[PDB]
Amino acid sequence: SNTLFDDIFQVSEVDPGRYNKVCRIEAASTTQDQCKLTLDINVELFPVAAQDSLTVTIASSLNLEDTPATRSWRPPQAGDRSLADDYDYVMYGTAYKFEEVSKDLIAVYYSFGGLLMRLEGNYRNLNNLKQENAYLLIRR
């Protein structure tokens, strides 16, 4: 429910690869000099250019109320309130690796249906991420 991770990243590089709808972005934090991000984005739905400031958030759930997927996903009814309302591009995915880059840096790997993300940073603001399912919310 609550925000597991929130930061602002500066998109250093955008690589289309061999794809037409998905681009892999290299970004680094505007505040920290150590928290960086590799991220696959459907740029057809959310175009991203270089030198872009993206607010990036990882949450455990989209509902505003605190936590009390295994539940079947349903189309959003008219008037439903969610954390996605304040952001532009929301993916949902599974954490599949917790790598230890150095004595201070941990990298967390997420798969949003095959769209991969690697969030590398020091552990005292990445400690909220655990081996679970998370929502990635991106706004410009």
Partner: protein
Amino acid sequence: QNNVLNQIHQILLPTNGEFIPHIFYSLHQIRKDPNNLSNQLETLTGSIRHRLKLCKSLISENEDTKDLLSKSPSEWQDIIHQREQELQIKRDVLDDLYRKLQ
């Protein structure tokens, strides 16, 4: 000075860091480098947590001490005082034969 009572007493209250001194010494040691993963305090208190498991094993493996720990000390003192006079009546119906023989 029962044996297992002595072992649990001198593993729970050493004659050193009981539970708090090791942990605040460790969290004072974090001040040198708060960004080292081998400097987690869980790594340093894992030995203490294994000592807790050893205390649980030493408590569980012994049975008469387990029976002793079940009732309050006032209850044990009252029950031993109220079970003494049964032995007193056993002794007096034992040695009334002394006055019966004369």
